[PDB]
Amino acid sequence: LLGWGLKQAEEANKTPDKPDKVWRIQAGKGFNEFPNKEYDLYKSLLSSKIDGGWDWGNAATHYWIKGGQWNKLEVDMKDAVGTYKLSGLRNFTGGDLDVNMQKATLRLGQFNGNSFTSYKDSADRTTRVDFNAKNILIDNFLEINNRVGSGAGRKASSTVLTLQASEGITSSKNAEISLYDGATLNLASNSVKLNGNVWMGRLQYVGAYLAPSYSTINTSKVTGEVNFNHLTVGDHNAAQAGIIASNK
Amino acid sequence: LLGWGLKQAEEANKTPDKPDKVWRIQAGKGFNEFPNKEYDLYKSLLSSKIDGGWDWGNAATHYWIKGGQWNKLEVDMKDAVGTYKLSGLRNFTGGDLDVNMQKATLRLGQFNGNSFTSYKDSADRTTRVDFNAKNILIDNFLEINNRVGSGAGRKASSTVLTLQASEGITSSKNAEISLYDGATLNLASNSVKLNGNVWMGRLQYVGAYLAPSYSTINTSKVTGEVNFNHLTVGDHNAAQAGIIASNKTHIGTLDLWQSAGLNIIAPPEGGYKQKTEVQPTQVIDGPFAGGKDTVVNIDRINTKADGTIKVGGFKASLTTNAAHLNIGKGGVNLSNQASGRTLLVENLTGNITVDGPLRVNNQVGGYALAGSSANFEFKAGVDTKNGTATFNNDISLGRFVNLKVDAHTANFKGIDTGNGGFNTLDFSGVTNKVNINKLITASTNVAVKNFNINELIVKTNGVSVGEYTHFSEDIGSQSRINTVRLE
Amino acid sequence: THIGTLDLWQSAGLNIIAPPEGGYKQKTEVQPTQVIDGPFAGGKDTVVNIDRINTKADGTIKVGGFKASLTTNAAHLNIGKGGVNLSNQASGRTLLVENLTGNITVDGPLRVNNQVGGYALAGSSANFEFKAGVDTKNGTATFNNDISLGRFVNLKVDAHTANFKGIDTGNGGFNTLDFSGVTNKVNINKLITASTNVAVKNFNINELIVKTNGVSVGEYTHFSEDIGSQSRINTVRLE
């Protein structure tokens, strides 16, 4: 009823949030001289200030930052050389990550998928999850603004994911990127080549066939060769997706 | 579930507290000219502003500072000469002592032990108990972050003890230092020599076998000769202790548990060193490489193995990033329940020089049953991939015991497994060479990619078949044997 | 009660109860008379024709077995031609075919892991167990089928007169063939043993086989209790 041209144009120009308790974590010595170690990133670094949990009402897991979903953290590596992976961060509510990893290969999926969601609070917040790796190499599925459990409990508000590599954002064959009703995606590397099922717009809930279900994959900064392989818009609804591409 | 490497790295960088009522006591005249008086320190000085009590719910005693557990005091002597003792401060909750005693010998135990605990409040406070004596001379047991009474009442949060002498922190024979789930310990003298039972990780409560139970003995500043005598990690749980040492650590008998970890960390190369709100920079540590002359001379590794039976072993382990991990003449023991226990003598960026007999159930042969597959395991130079695992003693493995060595060049002097059989003699991680000097096999699962075993024995194994020497992977190109001797 | 395939669990009980002999039949407050039952004896013609007993055995490992059991106070517990199966995890599972005031007439092969031999490892001591006529002490446990026990399987029969047709344990060895509860007689018709722990107080086993057991020693037929006065064997045959 609104249209995507209003929705993206009003979500692109926003202040991020106003969070209290800006946590700051710096990866000190130990990381920055083993170029091939294949670290973990959740357990070895991020699980100090990301706490799991259980939501009374349709939980499988439940992740936030620290003492609620309204607390920013940041990670400032800038020299940590190696290769990192998330591998299982599911139903992350959280809010305002930015894992600043220059010269660090990421891998945002291994043996288990990932998810980045928010909650429809009275403040109507986003997530603004950011990354700044060198390659990214998605390699397993990622569900942006998914359903948390099944229908009930707290509903899911909008989100923003930003992947800002500098050598390429590739993907594997079985990496289902599926962003939903409120989700966006900003890319800024060169030569995005997503060789998997990109799924803009999905049934967020079990029977709501009449949802608006907008999305956005704003590949605006991509100075190289955009290359999707399997794009799929909409599922049992009137989805209105939009890709602000980079003229190739 | 968190790991010790997160826990110590987040507890090492903290502001102490924000206490109201900073008491200040100065020891004036009277003390500072009797050099040999053998004072008391609690009764003659500290009991003016440390009040005892009773907690309704599992009390034996109850000590705090003044009007609650959130009040700092300090003692500023700086010239009081003599010898002082605590002798009976038990279940001290308190908070923020620092007994600044230059040129004053302490004695932190006489006829009665000591304890330093906190409470899990809504503020989640530490204790930060400090001392600044000249010698310390522990001489009776000290329980850091103990249980207050028995289970109920208020639970115990973290604590920090700091002992900062300048001539030596020794101990007596019956001084059981036993620090628990939240406790740390910082030492800064020269030549710590704890001749008693150091007990990192203990059952804090009566039945909670599933506690995390971390600890830390951060002997970082010790410019002399660290010397433990009897270190014991873990009790009926999965304790993950860690010792941030000062690149020379002779210890004595080490007694791990079934599932007890140990993170001995040598120093680096150059040594150490409505409204938004900005939390401070929480610098975290990764697994780094120790300096050049970092030596950890652990001389006996036992394991206390009883209890339940799990689907595997329990994988006792120690993790060292020093440039050497010498293990002396006591060798390696391994107690064995019905499932096969597992020992993981890991080394991140160093060597391993075991010079002792690999026992199991405290004998050299050590037969084990089929469900009890004992798993010795060595990891020499993991993250740098140029570490040797030299075993200068003639090892002897019995039945259902599974050595595995994942190193660069695993030198040996002799492997004798023909007595027991059914031995998984894995060498799959070996980069290039396994220079075994003597081999005795009956029914083995040897897997070497390149070697030169200059003596070989082909034994028989009774009358049964299906039991044989099985080089179950590729032998490569530079392989060699200088003597094969079938019997 | 003719039933068909019975599938117990590791720790599943079963109380089949036959009827009795004549068949069935501020302020205080009086609760009604709560008449309770004890374990009584069934009538004369009480028959429970269970024809196959399996066991689904997977899951955790406990310090013993788990002792699957069924408890019957009928005057007969006929077990037909399906016999007895017993799945076995790492610990030795246990089957308790109890009878309070009756007989047991098993006419089938005592399998384990669904084969007749059924080798089991040292920690897996499979424990067959029979209790024929407990509270009246005059119940026979007749096994009219030639049983066959492999390795680390432990039959025990606590009855009045445990008749048989043949016991064959010389193939497996390490078998605790207990008969300690037997009142007077164990009338085995054929015996094959290698390394067994037979404990009979009075018997007449009219055929005996003394097997060897490889080259190891410490493995032998061991009548590990008193043989009494009325004992008898009508044929011993060493091999």
Choose the closest CB to B371 out of C63, C90, C215: C90
Query: How many beta carbons lie within 10 A of that of residue B281, not counting itself?
Result: 12
Q: How many CA atoms within 13 Å lie on the side-chain side of B291? A: 15
Pairing of strands B375-379, B404-405: parallel
Token digits of residue A146: 């998914």
Question: Which has the closest alpha carbon to C107: C129, C77, C132?
Answer: C77
Q: What are residue C193's DSSP bridge partners?
A: C210
Please list every residue in chain B whose beta carbon sits closer than 8 Å to the beta carbon of residue A96: none
Please list every residue in chain B whose beta carbon sits closer than 8 Å to the beta carbon of residue C215: 462-463
Q: SS3 for B10?
A: helix
Q: What is the DSSP letter of A103?
A: T
Cβ-count burial A2-33 (b if 16+ within 10 Å, e if not): eeeeebbeeeeeeeebebebebbbebbebbbe
Choose the closest CB to C123 out of B371, B462, B463: B371
Q: SS3 for B248?
A: strand
Token digits of residue B31: 């003390």
Cβ-count burial C91-123 (b if 16+ within 10 Å, e if not): bbbbbbbbbbbbbbbbbbbbbbbeeeebbbeeb
- Residues counted in chain A: 248
Q: What are residue B51's DSSP bridge partners?
A: B64
Cβ partners under 8 Å of residue A43, min gap 6:
B3
Name the residue ranges covered by the structural domains of chain B.
Answer: 1-487
Q: What are residue C156's DSSP bridge partners?
A: C129, C178
The torsion angles phi and psi of A173, rounded to 5 degrees, stand at: -75, -35
Q: Provide the terminal-to-terminal Cα distance of chain A, rounded to the nearest Å.
A: 30
Residue B253 CA to residue B273 CA, distance in Å, equals: 32
Residue A113 CA to residue C35 CA, distance in Å, equals: 61
Please list every residue in chain A whose beta carbon sits closer than 8 Å to the beta carbon of residue B289: 33
Helix (H) / strand (E) containing C70: strand C68-72
Choose the closest CB to B370 out of C121, C214, C215: C121
Residue A4 CA to residue B481 CA, distance in Å, equals: 75
Question: Which has the closest alpha carbon to B310: B209, B171, B173?
Answer: B209
Pairing of strands B415-416, B395-396: parallel
Q: Do chain A and B touch: 3 or more Cβ pairs under 8 angstroms?
A: yes
Token digits of residue B451: 């070697």
Please list every residue in chain B whose beta carbon sits closer than 8 Å to the beta carbon of residue C123: 338, 369, 371
Sign of the dihedral defined by the CA atoms of residues A23, A27, A29, A30, in that order: positive
> Phi/psi class of residue B341: alpha, beta or left (left: φ > 0; alpha: ψ in -120 to 50)?
beta
Cβ partners under 8 Å of residue B226, min gap 6:
B191, B192, B219, B245, B246, B248, B249, B250
Contact C215 B371 (CB under 8 A): no
Taking CA atoms, what residue in B is nearest to A46?
Answer: B6
Cα–Cα distance list, B63 to B88, B95, B155, B163, C152 (Å) = 11, 10, 15, 20, 61
Report whether A215 contacts A244 (CB < 8 A): no
Report whether B326 contacts B296 (CB < 8 A): yes
Helix (H) / strand (E) containing B376: strand B375-379
The torsion angles phi and psi of A9, rounded to 5 degrees, stand at: -70, -25
Resolution attained, angstroms: 3.5
Q: What is the DSSP letter of C135?
A: T
The torsion angles phi and psi of C177, rounded to 5 degrees, stand at: -95, 75
The torsion angles phi and psi of A40, rounded to 5 degrees, stand at: -105, 155
Helix (H) / strand (E) containing B114: strand B114-116
For tokens 């962003």, the residue is A179
Q: What are residue B162's DSSP bridge partners?
A: B130, B186
Report whether B334 contacts B376 (CB < 8 A): yes
* Amino acid, single-letter form, for residue B149: G
Token digits of residue C190: 């054929």
The torsion angles phi and psi of A115, rounded to 5 degrees, stand at: -155, 145
Q: What are residue C5's DSSP bridge partners?
A: C52
